[PDB]
Amino acid sequence: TVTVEGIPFPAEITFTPAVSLVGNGITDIEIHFLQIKYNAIGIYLHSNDVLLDHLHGWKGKSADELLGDDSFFQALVAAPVEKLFRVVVIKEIKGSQYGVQLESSVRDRLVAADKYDDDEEEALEKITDFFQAKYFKPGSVITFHFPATSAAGAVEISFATEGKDAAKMKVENENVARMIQKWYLGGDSAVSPTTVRSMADRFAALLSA
């Protein structure tokens, strides 16, 4: 177990497999010299040899070298491995506020690669409508499940607030999926650089022995 801002995070989220925690951090912002800690993020990954193969070209590098190498994080996004994003809400916000932030971030990454048409638009609409109904209480846990291959499942976006049961939603438009993946696992472009620095120190270890 590992605590982030007093929020416990499991070392391994099995029963999903064997995804292991590789990065920890928070989503924050500074408005008028004041830190606003929104979320607590934990990135889980399955440590198969497929990962150590797709990341072998970065073996022996340092955390400061992986951090400046935005291609290492793109190769990490493009790994065919079960992934899990565990975002725990810290500050009470409307679920729509996180929805318009997920849309605008993914839409911009979609327009950059020209991969924005109508198939991506509806898959983005199904996500915004999913979050605008729920309200983020300090304890709610959004969960992104990225299976290893497109054969097994698709992409499961789970919600877990205290009281009600786990509200889940499936998306299969892989364009929006691997842009949400870039939103959390990107280099200098990710939403939580604190989570990125944690992956750098972790991967720099495995990718050294």
Numbering used by the authors: 7 to 22, 27 to 219
Question: Which of the paper's sentences describe this entry?
Answer:
Chalcone synthase (CHS) and chalcone isomerase (CHI) catalyze the first two committed steps of the flavonoid pathway that plays a pivotal role in the growth and reproduction of land plants, including UV protection, pigmentation, symbiotic nitrogen fixation, and pathogen resistance. Based on the obtained X-ray crystal structures of CHS, CHI, and chalcone isomerase-like protein (CHIL) from the same monocotyledon, Panicum virgatum, along with the results of the steady-state kinetics, spectroscopic/thermodynamic analyses, intermolecular interactions, and their effect on each catalytic step are proposed. The production of these value-added products also offers the prospect of increasing the value of the crop, especially because many of these compounds are soluble and readily extracted. This study characterized the enzymes involved in the first two committed steps of the flavonoid pathway, CHS and CHI, and the non-catalytic protein CHIL. Through crystal structure, molecular docking, mutagenesis, kinetic analyses, ITC, and FRET analysis, our study provides evidence supporting a revised catalytic reaction mechanism for monocot CHS and CHI and identified an intermolecular interaction of CHS with both CHI and CHIL in a non-competitive manner.
The electron densities corresponding to the residues from 6 to 21 and from 26 to 219 among each of the 223 residues in the native PvCHIL molecule were resolved. The overall secondary structure was composed of eight β-sheets and seven α-helices. The structure of PvCHIL was very similar to that of PvCHI in terms of both the number of secondary structural elements and the overall three-dimensional structure with a backbone RMSD of 1.21 Å. The area of the largest structural differences between PvCHI and PvCHIL was located at the residues corresponding to the ligand-binding pockets of CHI. However, the corresponding primary sequence for those secondary structural features is not conserved, as the active site is replaced in PvCHIL with the following residues: Arg-35 (Thr-37), Thr-47 (Asn-49), Asn-113 (Ser-115), Ser-190 (Trp-193) with Tyr-106 (Tyr-108) as the only conserved active site residue. Close inspection of the results indicated that the PvCHIL utilized its unique protruding loop between β3a and β3b to bind near the homodimer interface of PvCHS. The interaction between PvCHS and PvCHIL was endothermic with ΔH of 31.88 kcal mol−1, ΔS of 127 cal mol−1 deg−1, and Kd of 76.3 µM. In the presence of naringenin and naringenin chalcone, the Kd was 7.46 µM and 170.35 µM, respectively, indicating that in the presence of naringenin, affinity between PvCHIL and PvCHS is increased, whereas affinity between them is decreased in the presence of naringenin chalcone. As previously observed in snapdragon (Antirrhinum majus) CHS, promiscuity of PvCHS was rectified by PvCHIL, yielding much less CTAL and BNY.
